[PDB]
Structure formats: C-alpha cells, structure tokens
Design a protein around this nucleic acid. Sequence first.
DNA 1: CATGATGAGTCAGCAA
DNA 2: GTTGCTGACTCATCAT
Lengths: 99, 106
Amino acid sequence: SLTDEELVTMSVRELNQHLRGLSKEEIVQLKQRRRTLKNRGYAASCRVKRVTQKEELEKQKAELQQEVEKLASENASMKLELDALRSKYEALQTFARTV
Amino acid sequence: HLTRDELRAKALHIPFPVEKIINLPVVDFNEMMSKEQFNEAQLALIRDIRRRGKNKVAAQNCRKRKLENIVELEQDLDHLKDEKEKLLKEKGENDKSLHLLKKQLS
DNA sequence: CATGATGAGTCAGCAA
DNA sequence: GTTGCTGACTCATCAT
C-alpha cells in the first residue's frame, strides 16, 4: 500500500508506476484518494495564509497603537509645559508694557 | 422535489416539516416535542436535522466574521496611520513654538 | 438535554 | 484529464 505523505507528494506520472496488481476501480480510487489528500493540503495552506495575514495585521496595529499612545502622552505632557511657559512669557510682556 | 433530509424525516414518519425542525425557537420546539411519543430512532433524526441546520448557519456566520474582522483591522491601520501623522504634526508645531520661545529668551 | 463558535477535513464547483 | 482555490457542509470540541 501507500501512506498519506507518499501519495500526496507523488506526481501524476510517478503514480503510474505504482499500479501493479490494481483493478480499474482501485486505480480510480487511488487517484481520487490522492486528490482528497491534495484538497486537505489546499485547505490547510489556505488557512495558514489567512492566519498569517491576520496576525501580521494585528502586529502592526499593536505596534502603532503603543506608538500613538506614547506620542499622545508625551504631546500632552509637553503642551502643559508650553502653556505654562507661554503664560509666564505673556506676563513678562504685560509687565514690560507697564514700564 | 424533496431534499434528502425531508425524505429521511418522512421515512421515519416525522410529522413536522424540516423548516420547522430547524427554525422553530427553542421554547416552541420543546413544547411541541413534549406532545409526541417518538422512539429513539425518531428523536435522534429530529435532533440531527436541527443540529446540522443550525450549525451550517453558524459556520457561514463564522466565515463572514473573519472577512469583516480583516476589514476592521485594515480600517484600524488606516486610522492609526492618520492619528500618528496628526500627532507628529501637532508635536512639530509645539516643538517649533517651544524652540522659538527658548530662542527669544536666549 | 439545549444552545453557539470554530478548526480540520471533506466534497463540489470553479477558472486556468 | 490535473491544479490551486474556495464556498458550503459536517464532525468534534469547547463553552454557557
């Protein structure tokens, strides 16, 4: 007989060398079995690329998320310092106009 | 003509239509079930028709949520890139304002 | 028992 | 005819 891995990686031509002692229906069923194992791999490969794309999108999102949160936090912390400096700056200009 | 599930149900003398077996709400299904005297074969077929009918809806809903979740992730990436650009622009103007104030003060 | 979500596998049908 | 995809259905689980 033949295993699942041996059959799925077998080319069509190479499968023609493993027909010793098989009926016409046994050959058709063996090819149909190879097609089924092929479909099992197509489905698994289709799901690998979908998981790959999703995890890659969620990786960029998490990286940009912590990037944006740090930017928003540092911008707010610095805006406070700029408002305090500008507030003291305008008080000096106001005091200078008194002179 | 009659689907395979409809033929199986009538072959076991099930009086309900297949659409009713699948789509009746749980409460109406239980009370209807309680007014009958089914044997084990009949009960198992009714449950099998209902379970498969409901699960294939759950399977297609689950596939559609995967596609929608990808659209949301790409929307999330699009907004995050805009938010980062907006915060960088805000950080730039605030940097230029603070630099000049420190420069005028020498 | 009831229910719903989900990965893996299977089949059908498509385009190439 | 084969290949690679993919929507659809089903089973097997996990959870409430």
